[PDB]
Amino acid sequence: SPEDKELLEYLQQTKAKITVVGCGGAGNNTITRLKMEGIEGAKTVAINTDAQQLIRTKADKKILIGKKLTRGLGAGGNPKIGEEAAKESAEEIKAAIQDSDMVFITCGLGGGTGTGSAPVVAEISKKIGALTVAVVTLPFVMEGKVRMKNAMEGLERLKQHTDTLVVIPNEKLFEIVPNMPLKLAFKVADEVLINAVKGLVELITKDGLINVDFADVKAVMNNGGLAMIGIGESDSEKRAKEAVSMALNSPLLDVDIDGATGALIHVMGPEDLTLEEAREVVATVSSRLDPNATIIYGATIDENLENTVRVLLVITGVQSRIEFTDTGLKRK
Numbered sequence: 001s002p003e004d005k006e007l008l009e010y011l012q013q014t015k016a017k018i019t020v021v022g023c024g025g026a027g028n029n030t031i032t033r034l035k036m037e038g039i040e041g042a043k044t045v046a047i048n049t050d051a052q053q054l055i056r057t058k059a060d061k062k063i064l065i066g067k068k069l070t071r072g073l074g075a076g077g078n079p080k081i082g083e084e085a086a087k088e089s090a091e092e093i094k095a096a097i098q099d100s101d102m103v104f105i106t107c108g109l110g111g112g113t114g115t116g117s118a119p120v121v122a123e124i125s126k127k128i129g130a131l132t133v134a135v136v137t138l139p140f141v142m143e144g145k146v147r148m149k150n151a152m153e154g155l156e157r158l159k160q161h162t163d164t165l166v167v168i169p170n171e172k173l174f175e176i177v178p179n180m181p182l183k184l185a186f187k188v189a190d191e192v193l194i195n196a197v198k199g200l201v202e203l204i205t206k207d208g209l210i211n212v213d214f215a216d217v218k219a220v221m222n223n224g225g226l227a228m229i230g231i232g233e234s235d236s237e238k239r240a241k242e243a244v245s246m247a248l249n250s251p252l253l254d255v256d257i258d259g260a261t262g263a264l265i266h267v268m269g270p271e272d273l274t275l276e277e278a279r280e281v282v283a284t285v286s287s288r289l290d291p292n293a294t295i296i297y298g299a300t301i302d303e304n305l306e307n308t309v310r311v312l313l314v315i316t317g318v319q320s321r322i323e324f325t326d327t328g329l330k331r332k
């Protein structure tokens with residue numbers, strides 16, 4: 001009906017449709033925490049090639065791709081199987097995000113499924129006009145040369161189908177956290193992924209002390225190119241003043257940012273989070289990027305955050321200072 005159709009539309013246009021998609025054991029592992037812990041204003045879809053894994057995964061919608069190829073046992077770190085498996089189910093996937101204004105594709109680069117599928121999804125995402133964003137991590141050195149090699153090649157493909165590509169050099173984590181088994185190191189990674197994907201999405205969908213227009217988010221990330229996360233947090237007197245400079249100095253931000261084209265700041269904190277602090281954070285990051293960089297900044301209150309202010313930094317437009325290498329990212 002015409003009268004209804006018009007009401008319907010008003011509804012849908014009231015807010016944006018965000019969809020977070022995680023591929024592979026890594027991606028699925030992230031999708032579950034977001035789902036359980038809850039992710040404001042975002043739909044969660046988890047696609048894997050391993051049925052057993054997809055089973056113990058929590059999400060709004062699950063999808064088993066590449067039925068033929070993989071007997072539901074995984075692509076065995078073979079990217080090609082992932083890419084093929086995806087396209088097979090390129091349809092049931094397109095329906096999973098069919099009406100999204102923005103779609104996030106997250107996973108852990110280096111394996112088969114993730115490295116493979118991640119880009120296929122990115123392409124499907126874009127064909128439907130959705131603002132496309134990926135948030136993937138690079139493999140640990142302990143993982144070997146072959147793993148990294150594939151990761152990088154996947155990271156390449158991904159770049160050709162994304163509006164703003166965010167990568168985390170899992171390796172740099174040891175420059176923060178101490179030495180530890182490849183098992184526990186993964187946990188550290190697990191955290192960071194959640195903080196980045198959640199922190200991003202929620203910078204758009206959660207109500208904070210500052211208005212964050214989707215029109216601006218869309219503008220700044222429509223050409224994000226390559227972007228790098230940066231995390232920090234303080235407890236002291238000048239927590240605001242610290243968390244910022246701590247995130248700005250996070251080894252995860254492996255690149256020079258003097259010529260930052262854009263940035264997405266999401267300052268989080270306790271009930272006593274003030275606009276000055278938020279202001280403080282933004283002011284700092286602002287004087288580091290291009291004097292004319294487009295900056296999107298929010299400031300919410302975290303349910304459980306006694307007296308700690310966490311800060312998420314996602315510097316976009318840094319592809320001009322990084323060089324893809326079969327062994328990883330080099331600071332060109």
Ligand SMILES: Nc1nc2c(ncn2[C@@H]2O[C@H](COP(=O)(O)OP(=O)(O)OP(=O)(O)O)[C@@H](O)[C@H]2O)c(=O)[nH]1
Nearest residue numbers: 024025026074075076077108110111112113114189
């Ligand atoms: N944070 C996190 N990283 C992990 C974990 N397990 C694997 N990864 C990372 O993600 C990369 C690939 O993800 P996998 O979990 O192997 O998933 P997949 O590649 O989709 O699976 P296959 O194609 O069958 O090999 C690995 O090289 C690791 O970097 C985990 O549980 N947590």
